[PDB]
Point group: C2
Chain length 114, copies 2
Amino acid sequence: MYYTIGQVAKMQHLTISQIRYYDKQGLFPFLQRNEKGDRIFNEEALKYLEMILCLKNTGMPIQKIKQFIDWSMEGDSTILHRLKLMKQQEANVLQLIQDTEKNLKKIQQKIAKY
Amino acid sequence: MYYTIGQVAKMQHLTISQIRYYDKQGLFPFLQRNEKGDRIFNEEALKYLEMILCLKNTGMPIQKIKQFIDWSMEGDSTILHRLKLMKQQEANVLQLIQDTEKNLKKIQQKIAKYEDE
């Protein structure tokens, strides 16, 4: 099965415009074309999509995500580079959670004050 | 005592230009004047800055943050408005944490995977 940008957009609660914009940014070099020439996502493509959105939604710069995608398609020769990257993002995301909790507390205290 | 835009930037680990952006966006209507005529931060101005940053760091749109500031300036006649805004943000931040935990799970699974070898 090869899913279309429209189906992917539906799956992700995103618009066709957003997905096309990411495509435009060079984030989907792994897309292929079906018999109709439509740019489609195979199972693997969707998994890459999940991570792309994950990294994007956790503050990783586009250029860095593209770098991650490039390494993934290069093969296990970059497995160490990628592991490093993910470990770094885990560390970054744990900090995000920590900082967001700190902000939640300020918000809640303000609510108490009111 | 007051503090300069520059000192506040250092304390808030902000760049001089970042704070000026918030200024242009009209988020510091509460800034005072020193004997010279410069605009500075007193203790209350800083408390407002911390919230501005808190709301901005949690994704609140700039226009709503300004709306929060303007309401705070109007006095306790907007207490219900402000209370409401915070309650919605709290709800938004709770969702944000859950969404982030979900993302953390995806990154961790990828880590487990990479440790194939």
